[PDB]
Amino acid sequence: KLAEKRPPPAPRLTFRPADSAADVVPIAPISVEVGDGWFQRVALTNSAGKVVAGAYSRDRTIYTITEPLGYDTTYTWSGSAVGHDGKAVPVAGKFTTVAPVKTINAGFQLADGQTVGIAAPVIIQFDSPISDKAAVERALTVTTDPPVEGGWAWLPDEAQGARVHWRPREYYPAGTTVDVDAKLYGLPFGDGAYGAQDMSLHFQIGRRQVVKAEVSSHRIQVVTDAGVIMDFPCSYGEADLARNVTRNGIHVVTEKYSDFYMSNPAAGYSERWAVRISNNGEFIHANPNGCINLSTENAEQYYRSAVYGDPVEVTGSSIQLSYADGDIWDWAVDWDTWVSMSALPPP
């Protein structure tokens, strides 16, 4: 004659990740939901007391974290959720994120905001080898305006570590803007290594400028949208021996010196108005070898015009630019060879 009804349910809390889990990836989904009830308060702190941000998805059945976490850190839940009957039951729990075997840092070779020439590669250099290069490359997106075809390619690791290069197939159209996103935080690089940090880079391609360098011509031409703006007598390597041959193929300008003191394989010299076109010791500069030599006042005027990433098309030479010459050799190989240095299939 009285009640005899079985009570309304207890709230059911489901934790992702679950209580006491270790080796949790710092960008994994982190949540807490309640059925048969709604949350009254939820918070997540790390071991040091820093709240980690999150918001409740509607009809407060779920609370989700909205910022990445750290490595080798233990996180605790605190809160309560009220059931049907009105009594509140605690939201308490723990977990711990991964400590990686090592964290592999990386960096771009250009700065955000840089304006570069129509042949600049995007260079990402790491400070360790990389076991799962495909996993890392799949974390790379390049977005161009206008959109342009290109590819990622891995070069042989340097002493500092592995390194990957992005090249357009044809030259960038002058003015193109470039956005590079590397989502490497919490990404396993394999063999227990993890990305150190997400990286992003914004830069612009500058004015179109192409150097035409036909060795048999004893001239160099500098051509922009204004046409031939420089046609200089010059001279190239005598090509007696191989050390004095100007490499064939499309070079990239990297560095330039008003006034410079160098010593490295060729002999050793100190010069003026040098524009470096290879890490092998080739320059456009003044002579008053390997290099392209101009009069001092023609070397100066070119030197001022030049920009990182400008292409230098050398033709009529008998040794083609190569890995053996150091960076930048990315334009000395056909496209099918470039897509073949991707750690992924070749669409």
From Swiss-Prot:
The keyword Acyltransferase applies. Keywords: Acyltransferase, Cell shape, Cell wall biogenesis/degradation, Peptidoglycan synthesis, Transferase. Substrate binds at Y269, N280, G281, N293. GO terms for cellular component: extracellular region. In contrast to other LDT paralogs, LdtMt5 is not inactivated by the beta-lactam carbapenems; beta-lactam carbapenems form covalent adducts with other LDT paralogs but the formation of covalent adducts was not detected for LdtMt5. It is an enzyme of class 2 (transferase). The keyword Cell membrane does not apply. GO terms for molecular function: acyltransferase activity; peptidoglycan L,D-transpeptidase activity. Pathway: Cell wall biogenesis; peptidoglycan biosynthesis. The active site is at H285 (proton donor/acceptor), C291 (nucleophile). Residues 209-315 form the L,D-TPase catalytic domain. Its EC number is 2.3.2.-. GO terms for biological process: cell wall organization; peptidoglycan-protein cross-linking; regulation of cell shape. Generates 3->3 cross-links in peptidoglycan, catalyzing the cleavage of the mDap(3)-D-Ala(4) bond of a tetrapeptide donor stem and the formation of a bond between the carbonyl of mDap(3) of the donor stem and the side chain of mDap(3) of the acceptor stem. Is specific for donor substrates containing a stem tetrapeptide since it cannot use pentapeptide stems. This is L,D-transpeptidase 5. It comes from Mycobacterium tuberculosis (strain ATCC 25618 / H37Rv). The chain holds residues 55 to 416 of 451 of the full protein.
